[PDB]
From Swiss-Prot, chain A:
The basal body constitutes a major portion of the flagellar organelle and consists of five rings (E,L,P,S, and M) mounted on a central rod. The rod consists of about 26 subunits of FlgG in the distal portion, and FlgB, FlgC and FlgF are thought to build up the proximal portion of the rod with about 6 subunits each. It comes from Salmonella typhimurium (strain LT2 / SGSC1412 / ATCC 700720). It is found in: Bacterial flagellum basal body. It comes from the Bacteria. The gene is flgF. Transmembrane segments: none annotated. This is Flagellar basal-body rod protein FlgF. Belongs to the flagella basal body rod proteins family.
Curated annotation (Swiss-Prot), chain B:
The basal body constitutes a major portion of the flagellar organelle and consists of four rings (L,P,S, and M) mounted on a central rod. The rod consists of about 26 subunits of FlgG in the distal portion, and FlgB, FlgC and FlgF are thought to build up the proximal portion of the rod with about 6 subunits each. Keywords: Bacterial flagellum. Coiled coil: none annotated. GO terms for cellular component: bacterial-type flagellum; bacterial-type flagellum basal body, distal rod. Pfam families: Flg_bb_rod, Flg_bbr_C, LlgE_F_G_D1. Belongs to the flagella basal body rod proteins family. This is Flagellar basal-body rod protein FlgG. One of its GO terms (biological process) is bacterial-type flagellum-dependent swarming motility. Its main location: other. InterPro entries: Flag_bb_rod_N, Flagellar_basal_body_rod_CS, Flagellar_FlgE/F/G, Flg_bb/hook_C_dom, FlgE/F/G-like, FlgG_G_neg, LlgE_F_G-like_D1. It is found in: Bacterial flagellum basal body. The lineage of its organism: Bacteria, Pseudomonadati, Pseudomonadota, Gammaproteobacteria, Enterobacterales. SUPFAM superfamilies: Flagellar hook protein flgE.
UniProtKB/Swiss-Prot annotation, chain D:
The basal body constitutes a major portion of the flagellar organelle and consists of four rings (L,P,S, and M) mounted on a central rod. The rod consists of about 26 subunits of FlgG in the distal portion, and FlgB, FlgC and FlgF are thought to build up the proximal portion of the rod with about 6 subunits each. GO terms for cellular component: bacterial-type flagellum; bacterial-type flagellum basal body, distal rod. The keyword Ion transport does not apply. PROSITE patterns: FLAGELLA_BB_ROD. InterPro entries: Flag_bb_rod_N, Flagellar_basal_body_rod_CS, Flagellar_FlgE/F/G, Flg_bb/hook_C_dom, FlgE/F/G-like, FlgG_G_neg, LlgE_F_G-like_D1. This is Flagellar basal-body rod protein FlgG.
Amino acid sequence: NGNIQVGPTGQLTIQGHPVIGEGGPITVPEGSEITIAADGTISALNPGDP
Amino acid sequence: MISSLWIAKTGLDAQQTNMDVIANNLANVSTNGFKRQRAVFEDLLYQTIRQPGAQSSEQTTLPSGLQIGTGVRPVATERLHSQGNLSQTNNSKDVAIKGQGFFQVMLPDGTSAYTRDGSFQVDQNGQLVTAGGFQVQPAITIPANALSITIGRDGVVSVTQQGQAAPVQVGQLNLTTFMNDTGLESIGENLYIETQSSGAPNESTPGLNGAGLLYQGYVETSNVNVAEELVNMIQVQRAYEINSKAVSTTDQMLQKLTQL
Amino acid sequence: MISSLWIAKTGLDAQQTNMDVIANNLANVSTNGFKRQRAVFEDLLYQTIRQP
Amino acid sequence: MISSLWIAKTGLDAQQTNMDVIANNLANVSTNGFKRQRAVFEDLLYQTIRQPGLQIGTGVRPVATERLHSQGNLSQTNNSKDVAIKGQGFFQVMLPDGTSAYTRDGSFQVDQNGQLVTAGGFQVQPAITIPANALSITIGRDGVVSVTQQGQAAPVQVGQLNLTTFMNDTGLESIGENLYIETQSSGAPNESTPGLNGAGLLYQGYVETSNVNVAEELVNMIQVQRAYEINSKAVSTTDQMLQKLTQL
């Protein structure tokens, strides 16, 4: 199930289970347009900034 | 109800607005001191979807993602403040501006507007007023038994009385110039009111600082070029037809989606 | 129904007024003590969709 | 019975309301001084299901239609009795029962004993009594109605056409025949002379046409038809699902 949701504090959870990356569970910069590449690279864009 | 239909609606609205601009320019061909308008359009929103520049494959970025855009919106209509052709009517009261100045007129409510139409009249009290009855500034007053009125190229006004071989100056007609002439708000009746985007009124007598020179017996005709208007008709019609074709295609797609 | 239609309709009335003035001026060529007419036009309403 | 029939029924009713608004806008495309209507849809209550988080909708319901009070185009009537308004303002017209309504249709007539009345015959206040032997009626920009008589070289002042301005023009109650009455959402009718205190000017010989744009109505009709078809399909799907359930 690849339906990933972003928590209020930026934790990536699938069905309430915190997703685990190469360094453990992922902490996303609170509020960000997450883009996942073809191999799993996560890019975060913060609102307002360029 | 569907995105393509909203985009086509915006396109139809833009082309319609272009048609209103064309029709307004055409209706005022015979208007003295009229300036033709041109509308400017801009792109509407662009849905981000795939972000262009986001890193795919750790070391390769994604160029030019899905920037799905919405329709079009008109930015603003800008007047073309150019010198209209001068027409000779052989009248003592018609004044034409050849440069970049405006006449100042007082509305009876207290404020002042600015007009370029130079067809002036005299009220029952002898004041120089506009054809709509608005009293031009300054309140140049003309004597009762006037034989000839001479408005010079420097804006000076002289009246030739009987028994006096020397004309007597009865006023001084000034021109108002602005930093930005497109920012004046047109209120109709060939009148512009000053806005904050048009700076502040700069008084200057005709011939110095840039104010134009005043010609007597001439009127500044409208600068509307009509063949350009006809060519713009042809486009404003095809573009509207093509946008309606897009509406029809979206309608057919939705109809087949519904019928299944 | 369409604003452009109304604007053209007025323009047509204005040009018809000009034509009538010209015709009246030409009809009175041989009359003594006649003063030819001349029509003056002005801008109608201005819709302020976006305030300048 | 819990089902999705009601949710799609609300959708059908909303599309019906939108189509009624569109048809009303199109039918009044020839009325003088008519403001187009737009219906605002805003959804119903939500039912929340608690986990050991999710909210299911119920449908859509019309809330309130707004009349667009933009200045319509002017049309030339060549009648000296017709006046159009340049700006925001309303003519005050006295109904027979005694309460004063407010109209923007500027097509007026003179009744059998003087008096300026609307097309429906209701008197325009203040009482502006036109003399019988009047040669020409002139209504100025600032609402001064002057009357010329044969002989006298000066026009005679008869009355002032005052404009009633509301702070909220949308909240007036449309009573029917091109008349609005003040309401709690459009209170404090402010009487003013035309040209001051934000009141509009008067053009004599012109009438203010309707505000209905045509392209919006036609494309909105297309959208309403297609959304109605979609909701009908949803109703049919729910019907088939219930039919399959009952046959067990």
